Design an enzyme around this catalytic site. Structure first.
Site, PDB file in Angstrom:
ATOM      1  N   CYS A 113       8.018  -0.722   9.761  1.00  0.00           N
ATOM      2  CA  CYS A 113       7.613  -1.782  10.670  1.00  0.00           C
ATOM      3  C   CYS A 113       8.778  -2.730  10.898  1.00  0.00           C
ATOM      4  CB  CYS A 113       6.427  -2.562  10.113  1.00  0.00           C
ATOM      5  SG  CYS A 113       4.889  -1.632  10.130  1.00  0.00           S
ATOM      6  N   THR A 143       0.808  -1.215   0.000  1.00  0.00           N
ATOM      7  CA  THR A 143       0.000   0.000   0.000  1.00  0.00           C
ATOM      8  C   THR A 143       0.844   1.270   0.000  1.00  0.00           C
ATOM      9  OG1 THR A 143      -0.129   0.036   2.430  1.00  0.00           O
ATOM     10  CG2 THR A 143      -1.887  -1.113   1.242  1.00  0.00           C
ATOM     11  N   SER A 144       0.247   2.363  -0.469  1.00  0.00           N
ATOM     12  CA  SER A 144       0.918   3.654  -0.498  1.00  0.00           C
ATOM     13  C   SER A 144       1.006   4.163   0.931  1.00  0.00           C
ATOM     14  CB  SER A 144       0.156   4.650  -1.374  1.00  0.00           C
ATOM     15  OG  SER A 144       0.276   4.303  -2.742  1.00  0.00           O
TER      16      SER A 144
END
Lengths: 4, 240, 240, 240, 240, 4, 4, 4
Positions: C135, C34-35
């Site tokens: 992350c 995802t962006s």
């Protein structure tokens, strides 16, 4: 000197 | 009253806290692990160092993986309400994320989890320091010429070596890291903030030590400790 | 001359050094990533923050894994003789030990290795700071109510989150960590030593942020940054 | 508990203490003393400054020599048991060792004696600060291009000018010294120790001010404040 | 380069500077002044203390009033361009504003004037420290139970006692003030800023000393040193 | 500017 | 102890 | 709020  | 700042941990509770030292020197033959000569010097150096810092020191020797877990679980169940902090020193063989009991491995995460903000309520918001003297891998450093708070918050892991690297111990003087840590605490505990003391420990280990080995593979090697801080305030061992 | 102390890095070289900011917002469809909405706010905040610290900032956007490696390799080949330090900020998706290029993974170790004491000689003995917003796993923090030197020395890894945990980013304000880091540098860079600034960043992230999500699994979660220091001296951005 | 240090005054009593400001602007015609234009700006600046420091400020205007003595005597008779310190600011005409009431001289020693360690027991061991904006003579500074404790202990006299010299006051902005003192307290009271704040006040007055007068004798003159400390501990206005 | 601060004196010049120690023990019979037993201990303590601070110490003994003036005038004529500061220690009998030569009085103002910002250009902007061990009067402290810069700027007068008071000297250990000053410089010169060192000197003299005399008038008396600072920057004896 |  |  |  020795390593653990 | 006047302006108040909340940038440092309150270290003026009736007690400084417990300092649990787990010293594993002799391992079961079945594990194939060598004895850790020099670790008793470390254990003694630490006992004296933390005694001068007013910690209730409890030295434990040659604990099995079951005993380590049982000990940490029991300690985490104690009432730490009147204690300012908690210190745990682990001296043993290890791998990344593992500390060895005399009969086998113990997940470091398992030990530290007992003291999580949500599991040991009497230590919530208080500094939980884990000093670890153990290998974190098998790499050698050749050196170079010249409302709520996170359950993981308020932990400080003072590792003896960088991730993935061996950690060095002198059979007569003790580990490079513990020797340096005790020396710096002795000289600066009543003057400097903890991270600054640990930084001097990094400098001492990095500059004053170099391995000597008959095996070329392990000769002339270096070491840099690794400070892992999840602390939220400055930590001074002195107050007032 | 009078007594001289060598407890702090010399930050009075002609130049403070480079501040490389790798900002990955848009990823190739094939990766399924995802962006990263809000990362441009982080990139801009960092650019302004380090500009005020007198760093030569170089912003890079949406780099492939090959471009990241090529960039870091080229930067490590530059002559840093007149520079006091080196800063690299990585803003992207990640896993433990990995940062994502727009088309795939990049081993964090590969990037940092280019700047090792023995590989980038003009940076030997100088602070090499790596600020990482990504992350480090998939765990969520639920929180709780109220001669020679080591080649790995002189590195500081300022991670946005604890090992094994997700890192939070607000689509409008930017990541919790970068927002806090920039705010603390703005207020304390001309007063406090770096570790003390990072400790205040830990406190800010830990106490002032809590996730809000329509998915109960990701709702009311907390975060604690992780300071990993292999520095050997105190680091002040100001001198004299 | 842990190691305790006694190097700083305890400033965490229930109250910071009284801040008495004696502002003499208008003098009796019989004395032949001019009005001190700009002193009201000083009085207001001080009131706001000490209010932010949490002091119980009491502003007194145009007091006779008898009123000054009576006021200080009454204040010294109060119970300061719950107060951390005492501050007295004197704004008036003066000579070395003298402060002027609206109708005549008051020996500075007479005022300070009321607060001696043996005369004001509730202030024994607590910092007694006397800030004095008044002339200490008629000299002009031309400048240059580019068990028991002593009864006199724990006093700090922050004089606006050097011994034997005139003290400067701007009719619109107030005295050079008070302007600078308030500015430095506003910026550093929550960060620096008092002597360090006063040192910055010395620098500000010494470097940023120069007199402008139509009389060549009083034109292009400089001023350096004079810190006289009999304090025995470091003084921080903030605590914790 | 990075952000630069100008809050501390530059003490990294090739030389720290001169430390002139005038030690007057024996006075001409015609003056009627007693010998100052114990002052040689002070002179020796100071010589060793400043030697460790890297000052070019020059000890002078039993100087007449003419010799004192001639010495200070000659010293002020030297080229101090490569020196960071200037220190002058006066050990003798005295009165307020007067230091005694072996044959008579010397106005303290006369001595210090030689080093004014406009008279000793090579010392302009550099700290000029005058340490004075001498009486400032005849009062006894009974104690109590439990563009341009000012020509007077950059001077620090560290007086042994409060204005108007006698100063105490032990015939065997030396003066209370010098004993304390040397002890504090020895322990803190490589750690604390000068004013903070002098504050500890005030505490030491005020708390650890009390006179013992066969004459009730001079028995059980106390002393508090007096720090008079016209310094404009923080003063650290160490650098880097 | 005036003197006190 | 003596005075100066 | 989103995760990275």
């Amino acid at each position: 000197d020795e390593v653990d | 009253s006047g302006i108040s700042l909340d940038n440092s941990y309150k270290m003026d509770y009736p007690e400084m806290g417990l300092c649990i030292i787990i010293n594993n020197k002799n391992f079961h033959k079945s594990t194939g692990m060598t004895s850790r000569s020099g670790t008793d010097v470390d254990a003694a150096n630490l006992r004296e160092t933390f005694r001068n810092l007013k910690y209730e020191v409890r030295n434990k020797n040659d604990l099995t993986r079951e005993e380590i877990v049982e000990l940490m679980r029991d300690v985490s169940k104690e009432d730490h309400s009147k204690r300012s902090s908690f210190v745990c020193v682990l001296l043993s063989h290890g791998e990344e994320g593992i500390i060895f009991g005399t009969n086998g491995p113990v997940d470091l995460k398992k030990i530290t989890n007992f003291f999580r903000g949500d599991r040991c309520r009497s230590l919530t918001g208080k500094p939980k320091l884990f000093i670890i003297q153990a290998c974190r891998g098998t790499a050698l450093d050749c050196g170079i010429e010249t409302h709520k708070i996170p359950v993981e918050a308020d932990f400080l892991y003072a590792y003896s070596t960088a991730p993935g690297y061996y950690s060095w111990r002198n059979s007569k003087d003790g580990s490079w890291f513990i020797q340096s840590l005790c020396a710096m605490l002795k000289q600066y505990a009543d003057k400097l903030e903890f991270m600054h003391i640990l930084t001097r420990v990094n400098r001492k280990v990095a500059t004053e030590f170099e391995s000597f080995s008959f095996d070329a593979t392990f000769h002339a090697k270096k070491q840099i400790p690794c400070i892992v801080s999840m602390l939220t305030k400055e930590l001074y061992f002195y107050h007032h």
